[PDB]
Amino acid sequence: ESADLRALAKHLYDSYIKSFPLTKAKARAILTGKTTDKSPFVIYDMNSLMMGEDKIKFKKEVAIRIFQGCQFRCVEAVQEITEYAKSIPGFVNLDLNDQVTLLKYGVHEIIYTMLASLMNKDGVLISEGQGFMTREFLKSLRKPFGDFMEPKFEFAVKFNALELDDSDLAIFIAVIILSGDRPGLLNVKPIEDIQDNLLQALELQLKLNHPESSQLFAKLLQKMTDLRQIVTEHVQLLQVIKKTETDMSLHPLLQEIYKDLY
């Protein structure tokens, strides 16, 4: 009943807060300026990028360096998402081969979902909200890097319109991970049994937490089908980038994921 679905929504929220250091809550505070913390270092060109090495973690050319930065962080995201998934009741009880497959396909969908939390039409928060890299700066990069992040901005503008909060996103993300239709699953039934349960939890959350916004649930499920198309575009631009660029190596964990994908 309602109770069991509120308890799930709560369990998932608590787990989301632990798994993800920078929530949408903190992210919005920073972007509006309503924080009592220092405004983040604005990176708008090669000069400001250079001056802003003192706030980022890179551990040879600009576009490539930015991509190595985005690559480092993107690996920490997979680890955060992986620990979150382990908290989704019954996810661990699944076939370990299924757990891998769900994550393999799910993480990019969830990375673009949670990127939108850090985005506005002008730019994206980086290095745990203490940097802000502008959209125009990322467009102005030389191709193929020129329009690598642009489709994420386009999505985030539309997605942020739904004004979802952390408690909504916690469940939305769980629903994306438990997609019983990922290529190469072995035991679909117990995946769908959990997603079914998560979708009720999500629907109830959206009624309680946005009782003026009607069929936000419907709108949100339409967006979930956009992400796939959007993630395929991304996978192929990366496919291209792997080939055309000789110098830069791709991180092992990313290679695990992207190999045998679409």
Partner: peptide, 11 residues
């Protein structure tokens, strides 16, 4: 065979 994903799930 997804060694790192395997380890991240196992850990």
């Amino acid at each position: 065979r997804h060694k790192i994903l395997h380890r991240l799930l196992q850990e």
